[PDB]
Amino acid sequence: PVLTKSAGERFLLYRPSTTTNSGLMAPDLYVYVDPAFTANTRASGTGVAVVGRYRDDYIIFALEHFFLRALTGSAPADIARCVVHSLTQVLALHPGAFRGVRVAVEGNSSQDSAVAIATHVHTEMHRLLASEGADAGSGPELLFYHCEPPGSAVLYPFFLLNKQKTPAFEHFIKKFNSGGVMASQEIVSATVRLQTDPVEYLLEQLNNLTETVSPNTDGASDDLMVAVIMAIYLAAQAGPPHTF
């Protein structure tokens, strides 16, 4: 009973443009992912959310509820074609617009996969722009979120979701029923059908939030929602993420 329907008419309604108003953006680009490694489950998709900043508010570029296909031996790489296949589409319609992006991968499933997952992300990102697109000779310049496991001093490029979920939700609903965030007119999708609305598909899933401690997800398929909210909590300030 959380996100107001007055905001939902607004957040569904207004379609601002980042093709023209790009110069009024922060040149950085947070992006989150939520890998779920099982298949054939209505909440086991993998979320994509990529967000930028205006002066004080936040703005959405692409959402992919990435299911797992059947018969997967190369499954982390497929997730890597998802998220990089998104970032290339954002950077594509935004020529010379962004300085550097920051990919976030959660490791609540395991710390083991996300290392080679983000490594395989930097692999294909490091592949693509040198092939074609434009002459951005290391233009959009990737960095990652490098975290520390509890009890291990070695920094790996991942993100724990331990203490952060409640201030992230409180930040998101702090902004969202105030009409802070918005979704771009040129919001990008690959997995969701170009016929159907992406923003409608988000807003259905946004409508399953819960109380002051927020034990959420009544339901199914929170991954887009949880993805957007961790993405926007990193769209504000926190500890520094860095280069790989």
Residue numbers in the entry: 476 to 693, 703 to 728
Please share excerpts from the published article on this structure.
Examples include herpesviruses and most bacteriophages, both of which replicate their DNA as head-to-tail concatemers containing multiple copies of the genome that must be cleaved to generate unit-length viral genomes. This is achieved using a “terminase” complex, which, in bacteriophages comprises two proteins, termed Large (TerL) and Small (TerS) terminases; but in herpesviruses contains three separate components—pUL15, pUL28 and pUL33—in hitherto unknown oligomeric forms. The terminase complex recognizes a specific sequence or structure on the concatemeric DNA and cuts it to produce the free end where packaging is initiated. Acting as the packaging motor, the terminase complex then hydrolyzes ATP molecules to translocate negatively charged DNA into a space-limited procapsid through a dodecameric portal. Each subunit of the hexameric ring is a heterotrimer formed by three proteins (pUL15, pUL28 and pUL33) interdigitating with each other.
After a unit length genome is translocated, the terminase utilizes its nuclease domain to initiate a second site-specific cleavage step, leading to the dissociation of the DNA concatemer from the filled capsid and the start of the DNA packaging into another procapsid. However, the nuclease domains are distal from the central channel (~45 Å from the exterior of the channel) and the catalytically active residues are oriented towards the sides of the channel in the hexameric ring, which suggests that head-full sensing relayed to the terminase complex through the portal would reorient the nuclease domain to be proximal to the central channel for DNA cleavage. The regulator linking the ATPase and nuclease domains might be involved in this re-arrangement of the nuclease domain. Notably, the two regulator domains, one from pUL15 and the other from pUL28, are positioned on the two sides of the ATPase and nuclease domains, as if to act as hinges to regulate conformational changes of the nuclease. We suggest that, upon receiving the “head-full” signal either from the portal or ATPase domain (possibly recognizing specific DNA sequences), the nuclease undergoes conformational changes around these two distinct hinges to switch modes from translocation to cleavage.
